Write an enzyme that holds these catalytic residues in place. Structure first.
Site, PDB file in Angstrom:
ATOM      1  N   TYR A   1       0.890  -1.095  -0.111  1.00 34.09           N
ATOM      2  CA  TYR A   1      -0.051   0.114   0.066  1.00 34.09           C
ATOM      3  C   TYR A   1       0.796   1.151  -0.306  1.00 34.09           C
ATOM      4  O   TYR A   1       0.745   2.197  -1.062  1.00 34.09           O
ATOM      5  CB  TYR A   1      -0.772   0.106   1.297  1.00 34.09           C
ATOM      6  CG  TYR A   1      -1.836   1.172   1.219  1.00 34.09           C
ATOM      7  CD1 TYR A   1      -2.866   1.509   0.476  1.00 34.09           C
ATOM      8  CD2 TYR A   1      -1.344   2.224   2.110  1.00 34.09           C
ATOM      9  CE1 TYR A   1      -3.535   2.832   0.419  1.00 34.09           C
ATOM     10  CE2 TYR A   1      -2.312   3.449   2.137  1.00 34.09           C
ATOM     11  CZ  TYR A   1      -3.247   3.722   1.261  1.00 34.09           C
ATOM     12  OH  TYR A   1      -3.929   4.896   1.189  1.00 34.09           O
TER      13      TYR A   1
ATOM     14  N   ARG B   1       0.857   7.947  13.084  1.00 34.11           N
ATOM     15  CA  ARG B   1       0.378   9.087  14.026  1.00 34.11           C
ATOM     16  C   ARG B   1      -1.065   9.463  13.751  1.00 34.11           C
ATOM     17  O   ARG B   1      -1.627  10.049  14.612  1.00 34.11           O
ATOM     18  CB  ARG B   1       1.122  10.346  13.348  1.00 34.11           C
ATOM     19  CG  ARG B   1       0.899  11.613  14.063  1.00 34.11           C
ATOM     20  CD  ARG B   1       1.313  12.758  13.128  1.00 34.11           C
ATOM     21  NE  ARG B   1       0.503  13.306  12.314  1.00 34.11           N
ATOM     22  CZ  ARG B   1       1.040  13.144  10.919  1.00 34.11           C
ATOM     23  NH1 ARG B   1       2.542  13.184  10.768  1.00 34.11           N
ATOM     24  NH2 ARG B   1       0.129  13.456   9.914  1.00 34.11           N
TER      25      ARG B   1
ATOM     26  N   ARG C   1     -11.653   5.366   8.073  1.00 28.45           N
ATOM     27  CA  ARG C   1     -10.286   4.952   7.284  1.00 28.45           C
ATOM     28  C   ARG C   1      -9.736   4.128   8.058  1.00 28.45           C
ATOM     29  O   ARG C   1      -9.150   4.472   9.483  1.00 28.45           O
ATOM     30  CB  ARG C   1      -9.696   6.185   6.555  1.00 28.45           C
ATOM     31  CG  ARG C   1     -10.413   6.718   5.597  1.00 28.45           C
ATOM     32  CD  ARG C   1      -9.390   7.826   4.899  1.00 28.45           C
ATOM     33  NE  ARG C   1      -8.928   8.923   5.811  1.00 28.45           N
ATOM     34  CZ  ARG C   1      -9.901   9.677   6.339  1.00 28.45           C
ATOM     35  NH1 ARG C   1     -11.095  10.028   5.819  1.00 28.45           N
ATOM     36  NH2 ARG C   1      -9.200  10.709   6.989  1.00 28.45           N
TER      37      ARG C   1
ATOM     38  N   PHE D   1      14.956  19.501   0.410  1.00 28.44           N
ATOM     39  CA  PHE D   1      13.715  18.996  -0.068  1.00 28.44           C
ATOM     40  C   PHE D   1      13.676  17.579   0.527  1.00 28.44           C
ATOM     41  O   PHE D   1      12.524  17.168   1.017  1.00 28.44           O
ATOM     42  CB  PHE D   1      13.918  18.895  -1.489  1.00 28.44           C
ATOM     43  CG  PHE D   1      12.350  18.311  -1.999  1.00 28.44           C
ATOM     44  CD1 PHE D   1      11.211  18.984  -1.990  1.00 28.44           C
ATOM     45  CD2 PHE D   1      12.739  17.020  -2.845  1.00 28.44           C
ATOM     46  CE1 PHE D   1      10.071  18.277  -2.366  1.00 28.44           C
ATOM     47  CE2 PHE D   1      11.515  16.263  -3.253  1.00 28.44           C
ATOM     48  CZ  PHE D   1      10.335  16.935  -3.216  1.00 28.44           C
TER      49      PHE D   1
END
Ligand SMILES: CCCCCCCCCC[n+]1ccn(CC(O)(P(=O)([O-])O)P(=O)(O)O)c1
Lengths: 334, 334, 334, 334, 334, 334
Positions: free
Chosen positions: A136, A183, A193, A253
């Site tokens: 997933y 979290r 969900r 980044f």
């Protein structure tokens, strides 16, 4: 110059609370390339998220999304999600996508293609095994890491190795995603969900939703600690990945989110608050008030320090205590 | 060695509470060079601000200040301002000025001469047009940026281009001055000083001081937003200027104040508190707690983050809303 | 891989809560070298600290500690100190020490041999003159700095000049030890330890312990200020030392402790709390929120800021006020 | 800019046939510093030379030459030596000396003071012992090395150790001076100058001037070889000195003379032509056609290849045969 | 690999008998880039040089030369110049040109375009004013430098600033052409080509060809000197351009030609032989026998040497003497 | 400090009139490691060449030479070669051998083992095929390259890849060995030794010794030319190998012997002198007059320059012209 490029950046700042600034900070061609990549993934994600779109309509949208990138007039007007403006004005985004150098288009289109397939695949099922949890995460986050890495190399601002080692890039995504999934237990539970691997939590309670019940708080935390221990296995790869970066804008980044993830995991470890609300990504010692995530040595230090924060809190009565000490012990020594 | 140079740094710390530390961190000869330059500028600034000095008496001191640099015994004992020690013990400062390499003396003196002329020009007239506002800002700050840039180039710590591109250097100064002017409205009001361009505020009220009256706050917050919009036009140049620096000590020196300025405009935008008192500089997102103003990509990221903070809050109502968004959007797409 | 090495890092994290992360962030060979050097120094320190070990039994252990490194089976089971495990499982530590490349071994054994002699020399006597204070500090900290510097150079990560400049390296250690000795006054008193130089404190009270009695508080703060003023004298060398470093991981490793030390001295200055418990290290301005301790310019600025924090708090009536402003003045100006 | 500085470089070229280019090639500040330092020493040395000035009048001038650096109008017009222009227009030179940073002024002034003393000291007495030979060379060349080294460090272009290690700096000078003294044996003689140490040549002939007598040409060569051998003892230090250099411009400046001197010493070793005229600089093998004195390894290689040209031509029948081989072997093994 | 690339290198070694080796030493992607760039420039110049080609037939070729790089079958078989092989086999070169990364093609293409226009613009007129001399030179050599600088940056081997500084790049080009023109006086006259600026030689003789009559030799040597003096004004920019380079291969590539030019100008200054035949390049002092054109300090030294070789011979008589001494004094003093 | 290490270096300079300099110029740990390695190789090679030693006695010595290194008393006394002193005083050298870090002992022992085996294998046969020529060179020089490359890496002064890529280290040795073999044809022949491959020379003459006869000078030059063409094939490897060195002292040590080899082949090509005496190695052009074999770009420029020297002298009728041109074209193009 371009008003469509100006518009694309309007959406980036609209849809990207944080990343927006760092993306705009990227050097040369990576700037626009990552901006569009973010927007196209943003749209795809919007469709996936929208529950007012039947599975019948959603599967074909996720599957063909990549080719929509090539249909100048394609748009979608039925979304009811907050960020749907990128769907209704997709021709603008898609038009700038086609302005990118061919080598970038190849990467973006390919990531969207595989991501659509994966997302469509999880529309009906939930995550069962720890293996499925990796699958997933790979679809929604790993591929993003692979794509970005391939964009970095294609632009030549980074070595070809960055885009070739797909396993390391995939680890960057999995770490970020698993950390977020861990979290956001409650916030997701209230949103119907479920993402925690069934084969893990089913070893603690009857239904994943039970971790919200105070009588289960203990089990909830034990499960919590086991998933966090699972996520910790990605740290070696994350370190390897960041230590290969040579461009400063690319580094900022990539390093910042990773550092933010470890701190979150640290704040969550053996913390009952995870099941009552969102948790307090906090302070740090005076040996992290001395450095920012802008150079590798500083990042290694920041990561290791958060490792020990977790190590200092491992209670002997925890079922995973042994496994947690172990993986951390391994990360230190490398 | 020199006890007079020590005295100079004592004055530097006295007059530059915050910034003395960054200046003292400059490499090699730029250190004393900038320290002295800062002090002679402070003295020139004190003479200009001092209102107990009549205009007829003040003009000759401004026009000849650059030459007093070569008058070993010249000092001013009649100022009543707070930083008058620099004028009273000027022989000590000019002594050290005269110990700098000739190529630096020439730069600092040339700037002092021009600043004096311009400061004289504005002793009687108030700032009218926006074009005049640039001129005034040029004289009291734009020239400092040009001065500092040529010291950098002449010292060789920075490329000859830095000193040659006077437009970008001037922009660095203009961005700070405008930010300060905008921020100091009330404090300049209660001090009988008018700096906001007349052709701007005279479209909201009959007299600048009217924004201080609670019944005009709304018209004030509008004029305020029109000036901040004006200021935002320098960011593309600030970024270009900073992107050419290669010396680290000089980079922190140039970048820190520009970042402080953008953060200040962010806080002031569409903020009524500007007219009630002093505005406190706001915290920041989580992707600004990860980095500091020491590398170019991080600074761009920062500038952009504050860009968005303003953009977010632009009320469609505002008469400038269109121009505010347009200049930001433009800064985001370069 | 190596379990004995994995064990060393377990002990490193066990015996160094606050610095294991930075050590683990060092590049290549320096990582294990410094890890081992730390464990070895930790063991030797524990032997000196243990008061259940009589002087006649301790002198030999200190003098011959350096040779035990080559005795595969040597360990020590009688310590009752908190870090006794490095002594009890010394064979694991010495084992990994003998695996280090010879160039590192030679340096480490060399330092242990001299540190031992120096430590044993002070078991009987208390520190008398200020010159004696430097000697002691030289034995327990300056040599460490000298040792590390030779490790850096030996590894080739740092220029040969780093390890050859023992004067500066020595100062790095002295500044650190004097700060801690000063800060831990109370803690060392209640522990039956006396490190403050007698030639100094005996001018304020009759016996070093008097500083704990609330009636002497004022004379205590005076002595405290004299000692702090003394420690500030090493700053120039600290700055020069750090400025020579060229490797990032090495720079971070060397700069952080010093910055923390300055912060500590700044918090302790003219602070009564030093004599009633532990002192809290505080935040510090917004210009230190703009940078961290990872680049030389930034470090100077942080050090200068803290210097000023002490400067503004010097009581004119303090018997050392002059000397304090003087040394701070010199640091500012150089 | 200043025509005075322009004039200083005009003289530099007039008086330094060979080294004005290398000096003008020094980075930043060292340029003017060394330029002035050179002119000043040339002026001084031009007084010591001028036999047209009576001892009584020359001695004070040498003693106070350093002081004239601070007298804007001091000059000398009775010199008849070739380079008299520096003395006649010394005010131009002093002006530029007073314009250098104080740290260079102090270095240069101190050296002139100490050099003037030694020069006067050796006006009456000739070189007696070998101890006296070192003393004489220290005053006319050693100090130059110490001074330059202190200028190099004060500029931060070189490490602090370069200026602190006065012994090594002194050797650089001693080696250059002895080398020249040895080679200019004859030239010295016609000019009535006697530099070869008495205690050495006295053990061969009646008066130093004898070696010029074709009959003594054999004993002359044994003395020649003993001095050369003496000089050789300085190479270890020369290598140590050059080994610390890090700035390419300083390195070129320092290395070249040293290399040209060793080549000279080798061309003069056991060569009778020394006493019949000016001995010239021999090319080299093919391992020297490949390298240039721009990197330490090459300079090292070059020095060793010259240690060999000398080693091979070492006569077993020479009194110093053993001592010469002893020193060369040491230089090879370090 | 490529057989056409091999052919391009065969052509490089044919047209560039000497420099081909330096171009081939270039690192990475610059190797082929400069190689091809050199070849297309030879072709273009071969066209401009050919006189059997009518003006109206040439102008169109020069103007469109740049577009030919994109037409697989373009070639020119009617040139009867010595390098015609690059025109008759242009497809091999264009094929390899079209093989270079696009970022390089863009630059080369743009340069050939601007250069074409300029050359055509001079096919009819002669060089009138000194300013026109700069335009002509800018067109045939200056752009070349600009081009090379942009390739260096585009390749990332040199800092972006190298490419951005077009004026310094232009001078590098100008110093080279002006030197060649000045020295090819005779050869060019025998070929009926006139390049010396008329506004300059006009003040001497009635027609540029007069300098061939041995009766004018003196008027010739004077024009010559005023022109060399002109060229020297470029040395400051040359030194500045070279100082900015940090890649060894690019440095060798840029310095060598510049050093050679200065050697030629010194060889031609006030030398009658310029009008008798070609001038040869020879030795130099002994401080040049120790350094090669591969490091900036060595290059400066060389330049400064030649600056002296000229100054040394500036006849009081020459009408340019004053100006020739001014520029050299200035070059020595920067 | 060791009198034995002192004797080793005396032998180094004694046996290697050249190599000793660059060896003694090696950084740190490699210095002695190489000095020793060179000494054991010289000894091993002095046995193999000793023709007064029967093949039956020799083979054993060669096979077990590597074992003599671990036998403190081994020494051969019956040698009649020039370097016999290294075999007679082998304990000295074997003692210093044993004084090296194990990692260095291992490399030197294994190589000496592999070499004795090969040298013995050729003791009676001659070189037939070109394949056998590569094998013979592999044993006497290729392995020395592999040895050194591994010492460099072990000592860590060079990347691990250097000792890794045994192929390139082999080519480094082959190039030097073949160049020597080719140059020493006559001297070898006169000493009754033959190394040129039979498969190659048999196609020209009935016996190798015939190239010594004047009537066969032309046939000799052609075979010479074919062998030179063969050797030229190792240059791409020689370049790749040199391009990976990061240690200046190592680079100097490696590049110089190679550049000397290239220079020798270029001077030997199509040259009759090869068969009449030894060949004197000329300087080169002025763009070799501008560099030294101390940086890759320079070395490359030099290698390429010599390639062109060879290219220009290739006779059309020469049986190897095609092959020679082919390889030169390849070296040019890579
Ligand atoms: C696209 C890059 C252009 C670089 C141009 C600078 C190369 C320096 C040499 C240029 N060039 C022009 C004439 N020559 C000199 C000669 O006439 P060439 O035979 O062309 O090498 P030579 O030195 O007497 O052999 C070489």
């Amino acid at each position: 110059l371009s008003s469509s490029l100006k518009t694309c950046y309007k959406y980036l700042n609209q849809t990207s609370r944080s990343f927006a600034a760092v993306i705009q900070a990227l050097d040369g061609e990576m700037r626009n390339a990552v901006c569009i990549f973010y927007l196209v993934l943003r749209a795809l994600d919007t469709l996936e998220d929208d529950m007012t779109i039947s599975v019948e309509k959603k599967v074909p949208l996720l599957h063909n999304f990549h080719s929509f990138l090539y249909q100048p007039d394609w748009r979608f007007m039925e979304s009811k999600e907050k960020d749907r403006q990128v769907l209704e004005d997709f021709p603008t985004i898609s038009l700038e996508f086609r302005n990118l150098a061919e080598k970038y288009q190849t990467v973006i289109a390919d990531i969207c293609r595989r991501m659509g397939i994966g997302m469509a695949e999880f529309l009906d099922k939930h995550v069962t095994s720890e293996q499925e949890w990796d699958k997933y995460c790979h679809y929604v986050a790993g591929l993003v890491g692979i794509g970005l890495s391939r964009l970095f190399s294609a632009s030549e601002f980074e070595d070809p190795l960055v885009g070739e080692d797909t396993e390391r890039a995939n680890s960057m995504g999995l770490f970020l995603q698993k950390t977020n999934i861990i979290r956001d237990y409650l916030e997701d539970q209230q949103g119907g969900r479920e993402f925690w691997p069934q084969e893990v939590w089913s070893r603690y309670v009857k239904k994943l939703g039970d971790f919200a019940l105070p009588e289960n708080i203990d089990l909830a935390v034990q499960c919590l600690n086991e998933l966090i221990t699972n996520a910790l296995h990605h740290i070696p790869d994350v370190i390897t990945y960041l230590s290969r970066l040579r461009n400063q804008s690319v580094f900022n980044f990539c390093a910042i989110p990773q550092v933010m993830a470890i701190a979150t995991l640290a704040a969550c470890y053996n913390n009952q608050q995870v099941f009552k609300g969102a948790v307090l990504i906090r302070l740090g010692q005076a040996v992290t008030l001395m450095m920012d995530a802008t150079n590798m040595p500083a990042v290694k230090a920041i990561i290791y320090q958060y490792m020990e924060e977790i190590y200092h809190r491992i209670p002997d009565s925890n079922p995973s205590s042994s496994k947690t000490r172990q993986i951390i012990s391994t990360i230190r020594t490398q």
